[PDB]
Every structure is written in C-alpha cells, then in structure tokens.
Amino acid sequence: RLKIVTIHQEPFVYVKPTMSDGTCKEEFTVNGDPVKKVICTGPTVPQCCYGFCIDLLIKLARTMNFTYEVHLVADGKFGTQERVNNSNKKEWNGMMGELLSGQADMIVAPLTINNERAQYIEFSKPFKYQGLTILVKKGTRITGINDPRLRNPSDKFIYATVKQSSVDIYFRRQVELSTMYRHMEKHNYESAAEAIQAVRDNKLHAFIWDSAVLEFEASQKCDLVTTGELFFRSGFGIGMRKDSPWKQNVSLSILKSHENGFMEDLDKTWV
Ligand SMILES: NC1(C(=O)O)CCCC1
C-alpha cells in the first residue's frame, strides 16, 4: 500500500471536505461523466481529492496493480532546501522532505523536475510539459522574459512571484536576471492565491508562475490572461526515491499516455 503525498493545486488536485457521512459528494462533469475522487488525509482529517493528478494516480494504480493511500503534505509545501540548524547540511521541506524521510513513497503533484531536486530523488518521465509564464490583467501585453518592462523595471509596472518558491530561487540564481530579482524581492507575495488576487485588484501588474497553473487560472477569470512566450520550460513528474522499482513502469505508462491520447483527454477534462 504505497503512501502517496500530494498538495492542493487546481486543476491538478482539488481538495474539498467530505460529506457528513464521511464520503465524497457524487459529482459529474459537464458532459455527464462521473468525477473520480479519492479520500486524502491531511491538514488531520479525511478530505476529498480529485483532478488531473488524481485521475493520473488512479490510472497508474490500475495499470501497475498497486494499492495506495493519499495524504496532503503536512507543511503545505512542494519542497526546497533550507538551513534548519547550525550544521552545514540543509534539509528538504515539503513533499521532497516527506519522500526522502519515508513519509511518502511517491510524490504525485505538479512538481517541477529541476536540477536541485534531481540531485536527491528521481523523477518519472514528465506527465505535463510546461514552463514559466506571466499572468496579467486582460489588455496587458508582455512579450516574455525579455520584455523591457521586466528587464528595465520601474514602479509603473510591478511584477513578482511567490517568496521562498522554486521560482523565486530560479531568479535568485540567474545572474543574468539580477535586475529583475532585485525588483521582485521587493514585491514577492506570500502565496500564489494572494498574488493572483493582487493582479485582479490592480495592485500587481504581473505574476510570474507555472504556465500549467496560470493557464488554468486565466481560463477561470475573464479579467485575467497569460501573456508572452514561455521561459524556463520544464516538466512535471512523479517523484520517487532513487532506484525505485516503480520508476520504469510509471515512466512507460506516462509515455504511453502521451502517445495514445490519454494525456490529451486529461487536459480536456480538467481545463
Ligand atoms: N511547480 C512548482 C514547484 O516548485 O514544483 C513551481 C511553482 C509551483 C510549484
């Protein structure tokens, strides 16, 4: 019974309360198809989880003949390396920390495959190809990471991302993006929800984040749109501890799904 850890992140993983009898409300898609849901414990009581990643998990479990139990990451984070003591060895938090500690056997979430994480865990082939993009108010046009309003910032156009995120780290390490980072570090938000709200409230002109997330957020709000070319393209993959016996088949299934329309069907169903 594999321990699956995930996190709230629509449309990949929705999190809702169970009904009074402890079950998940029976719901259907706009075309009458049943919405598959799994019970996921977390911040701790049983809750209802569903979405792109849950549909993927259900498919993998069926295809690979395994049972599982899902829980939401305890600290509500994806995972970054942080100094937590006087030693010289940083420690991973979020889902990365849980996978490495054994609290989880697989990370099933919109987790970016990057260099730092790849140094400690292994990933399946990507179940989603995306990259960083920009969220702005309808009518605003930004070409991409090279747009002057970003490279030559001023207070007339404020942009930012989420503090302590892997995206924040991406800019902090990009020497060529020092100018941008200096500007962002002065406006970064505590959470994506807050930043997205700030964009609708005209308090923030641009929010830099995952295109896989922003494309959905934009589709849900008419006053919001994504703009420009993607930069820092990346994939989302299932995380497992090194040398896992599940890796090969998880990867083969995902590659097969990209080739047989299954992944395209999830795209249409959830966005
Ligand atoms: N995909 C993210 C990650 O850290 O894995 C990047 C920002 C949202 C979460």
Curated annotation (Swiss-Prot):
NMDA is probably regulated by C-terminal phosphorylation of an isoform of NR1 by PKC. Its phosphorylated state is influenced by the formation of the NMDAR-PPP2CB complex and the NMDAR channel activity. Glycine binds at P110, T112, R117, S166, D210. A hydrophobic region that gives rise to the prediction of a transmembrane span does not cross the membrane, but is part of a discontinuously helical region that dips into the membrane and is probably part of the pore and of the selectivity filter. It is found in: Cell membrane; Postsynaptic cell membrane; Synaptic cell membrane; Postsynaptic density membrane. Glycans are attached at N65, N85, N152, N249. Disulfide bonds join C24-C48, C40-C49. This is Glutamate receptor ionotropic, NMDA 1. It comes from the Eukaryota. Heterotetramer; the NMDAR subunits are modular and harbor tiered domains that function in concert to regulate opening and closing of the cation-selective ion channel pore. Forms heterotetrameric channels composed of two GluN1/zeta subunits (GRIN1), and two identical GluN2/epsilon subunits (GRIN2A, GRIN2B, GRIN2C or GRIN2D) or GluN3 subunits (GRIN3A or GRIN3B) (in vitro). Can also form heterotetrameric channels that contain at least two GluN1 subunits and at least two different GluN2 subunits (or a combination of one GluN2 and one GluN3 subunits) (in vitro). Residues 141-271 are extracellular. Belongs to the glutamate-gated ion channel (TC 1.A.10.1) family. NR1/GRIN1 subfamily. Component of N-methyl-D-aspartate (NMDA) receptors (NMDARs) that function as heterotetrameric, ligand-gated cation channels with high calcium permeability and voltage-dependent block by Mg(2+). NMDARs participate in synaptic plasticity for learning and memory formation by contributing to the long-term potentiation (LTP). Channel activation requires binding of the neurotransmitter L-glutamate to the GluN2 subunit, glycine or D-serine binding to the GluN1 subunit, plus membrane depolarization to eliminate channel inhibition by Mg(2+). Detected throughout the brain, in brain cortex, cerebellum, thalamus and olfactory bulb. The gene is Grin1.
